[PDB]
Amino acid sequence: GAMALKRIHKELNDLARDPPAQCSAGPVGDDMFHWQATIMGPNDSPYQGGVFFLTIHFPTDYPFKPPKVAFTTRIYHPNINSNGSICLDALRSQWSPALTISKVLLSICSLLCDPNPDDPLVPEIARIYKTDREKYNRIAREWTQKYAM
Ligand SMILES: [Cl-]
């Protein structure tokens, strides 16, 4: 309804006025409720140099339910699966209307930097992250080269 549209426009404007570091987001075309986003691989992470795309769909009662957010770029990470689904509590049980796309993008950036142990969406990647970090990094770098450049 009009409440969601007002908030979504305000958030688009918030991102333009204070352009993050290393992320962007906004409507695909003219559909305010369907956005794209991009996140640059953080420096000093195995994703450095990559560019990762995401899709975002706002519900019609945003901001009082969460947006649906998924990666569209393949990534080697314990909490993001091959469907691009993202295990992040803010997008589920922990949503609040005080969260915004900017905060969500910052949280996903931090998640790339430091995975969540409790949430292995891809159990084998979570295992290599815990047991052999240098191997995890090497493979995450290789997938950044293959998919995100
Ligand atoms: Cl508002």
Q: Indicate the domain borders of the chain.
A: 1-149
Distance in angstroms (rounded) separating the CA atoms of residues 26 and 132: 37
3 CA from centroid of ligand 1 (Å): 7
69 CA from centroid of ligand 1 (Å): 20
Contact (CB, 8 A) for 56 and 47: no
CATH among 3.40.640.10, 1.20.1560.10, 3.40.190.10, 3.10.110.10 for 1-149: 3.10.110.10
Distance in angstroms (rounded) separating the CA atoms of residues 108 and 61: 23
78 CA from centroid of ligand 1 (Å): 34
Could you tell me which of 74, 97, 77 has the C-alpha nearest to residue 88? 77
3-state secondary structure of 77: strand
Contact (CB, 8 A) for 37 and 61: no
Contact (CB, 8 A) for 48 and 145: no
Listing DSSP states for 32-57 in one string gives: TTEEEEEEEPPTTSTTTT-EEEEEEE
- The answer for 44, left when phi > 0, alpha when psi is -120 to 50, beta otherwise, is left
Distance in angstroms (rounded) separating the CA atoms of residues 38 and 56: 11
Annotated active-site residue 113? The verdict is no
Could you tell me which of 91, 145, 102 has the C-alpha nearest to residue 10? 102
